[PDB]
Amino acid sequence: GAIMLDGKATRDEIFGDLKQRVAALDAAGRTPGLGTILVGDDPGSQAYVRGKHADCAKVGITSIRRDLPADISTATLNETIDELNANPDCTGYIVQLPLPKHLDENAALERVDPAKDADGLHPTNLGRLVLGTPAPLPCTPRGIVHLLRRYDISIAGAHVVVIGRGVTVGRPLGLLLTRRSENATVTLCHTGTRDLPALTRQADIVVAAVGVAHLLTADMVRPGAAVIDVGVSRTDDGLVGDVHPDVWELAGHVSPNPGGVGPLTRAFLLTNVVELAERR
Amino acid sequence: GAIMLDGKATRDEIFGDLKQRVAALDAAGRTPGLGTILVGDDPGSQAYVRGKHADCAKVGITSIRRDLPADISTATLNETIDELNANPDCTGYIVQLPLPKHLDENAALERVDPAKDADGLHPTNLGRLVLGTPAPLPCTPRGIVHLLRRYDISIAGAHVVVIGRGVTVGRPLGLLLTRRSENATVTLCHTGTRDLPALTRQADIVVAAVGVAHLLTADMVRPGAAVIDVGVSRTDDGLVGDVHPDVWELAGHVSPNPGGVGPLTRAFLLTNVVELAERR
């Protein structure tokens, strides 16, 4: 049976580090604050934002909320974005998605100041990742790499097969893993890929982030290989990951879904906020 | 023998298209202008900038030059950047590298307005490429894809092995080829890669962009495969590409070096400028 990549225990470890580092920022009069912009009342969006602020409260990060009605204008969204940009207690913030359809989501995301981009998803910071300039990194790719290293799985020289090209996971992950400080070989796969199994069988690490229930099966995985389960989709049975349970037999390591990468995404949101405050 | 991917003939074809499109912009009172910032007097830098403006003159694009002495201050560079940013005849511009060492190159590159980023290398536009928002694309990756398509080589479903992780070729190329509109599978290789030949032998398309003289040999290439020669390094014999001449025997297609991708990079610089003007 594969070793369980315990994301919850890893997240708790990060929280404890963050709490000390936030206490040190607080002592210097530099308490970090997380802002959130939430438009309307989608119950899932509400629950995500609650969760982020509850985690902030656990580590001592101030909560700044901008809760707006579903019918705001573009100018009202922009005023809020501009205000958070100029707000000296807001060290970083996120815009909760999805936005009401009368609102240009992407324009809103670009208007965010990249110096306050807690998600690490502003195009300017993603471009900086392409170019090798230090800047906020996207939370999920970053937690995937941290989880692997936490268990002493080698990254340098590894063949990583990434299944999925999502703008917040697959695509930025390929850029992160090919930096000299990581130094993995990456094959980027997706729905346009011919003969996926032949590629996954070569991989030391498989990252399944495509959102197709149990797509990755035992016959596609090299024995001993590390398997990261990121994608989630809805089936008749509820929410299911991208990795078939049979993979656990011969894989060396598997991150569970839930309780694997999900908690690391959240840890690195708070890590980004703390680091933005420390970088002054 | 492999089919020769004739970049010069392809570039000339693009120039002819651009000249007509520039004549149409001119007729609407919207003549495009290319700016260049050149600091000091490096002879190669001088020759590149001359070449870009000579190509502009061929197609009817106005030349805007900012030729600065090697000893300017940071504030003087910034004034020039800000001026080109606000210059209504400057539709796009480039900063010629390298800059004198007392000057922060990257800060200068970020200060450029991404709406005038003729090179497609501003971090904001590279982030937009990650995110799938339309924006200027980097010239070399774009010309590599155009050259392949010009010869009816399939991109969708292709396994592309990219050798090299340069910020202006390898890294952005991996992002470009994995868009749905391209839809290739990409393995990103580099000096950290274990057993490169085993990966290149799988490839339908090999892009050699690492700058290691004749690194790619016949035994590493699948018969019938398309080979793109981008890298250049200095040996005792002068300047040499990344592909060994023996590859020509069994490859289906090879771009020469010189006369392959080099001319396409230049064509897509002018294409970017023309498109920025057309997009209004």
Swiss-Prot record, chains A, B:
GO biological process: L-histidine biosynthetic process; methionine biosynthetic process; purine nucleotide biosynthetic process; tetrahydrofolate interconversion
Keywords noted in UniProt: Amino-acid biosynthesis, Histidine biosynthesis, Hydrolase, Methionine biosynthesis, Multifunctional enzyme, NADP, One-carbon metabolism, Oxidoreductase, Purine biosynthesis
GO CC annotations on file: cytosol; extracellular region; plasma membrane
InterPro entries referenced in this protein's UniProt entry, alphabetically: Aminoacid_DH-like_N_sf, NAD(P)-bd_dom_sf, THF_DH/CycHdrlase, THF_DH/CycHdrlase_cat_dom, THF_DH/CycHdrlase_NAD-bd_dom
Swiss-Prot/TrEMBL catalytic activity: (6R)-5,10-methylene-5,6,7,8-tetrahydrofolate + NADP(+) = (6R)-5,10-methenyltetrahydrofolate + NADPH; (6R)-5,10-methenyltetrahydrofolate + H2O = (6R)-10-formyltetrahydrofolate + H(+)
UniProt entry tagged with the keyword Ribosomal protein: no
Entry annotated with the keyword Endoplasmic reticulum: no
Annotated coiled-coil segments of the chain: none
Residues spanning the membrane: none
One of the record's GO molecular function terms: methenyltetrahydrofolate cyclohydrolase activity
Sequence positions that bind NADP(+): G164, R165, G166, T191, V232
Pathway of action: One-carbon metabolism; tetrahydrofolate interconversion
EC code(s) of this entry: 1.5.1.5, 3.5.4.9
Quaternary data: Homodimer.
Function of the molecule: Catalyzes the oxidation of 5,10-methylenetetrahydrofolate to 5,10-methenyltetrahydrofolate and then the hydrolysis of 5,10-methenyltetrahydrofolate to 10-formyltetrahydrofolate.
NCBIfam families linked: PRK14193.1 (NF010789)
Similarity comment text for this entry: Belongs to the tetrahydrofolate dehydrogenase/cyclohydrolase family.
HAMAP family referenced in this protein's UniProt entry, alphabetically: THF_DHG_CYH
Name assigned to this protein: Bifunctional protein FolD
Organism, as annotated: Mycobacterium tuberculosis (strain ATCC 25618 / H37Rv)
Gene from which the chain derives: folD
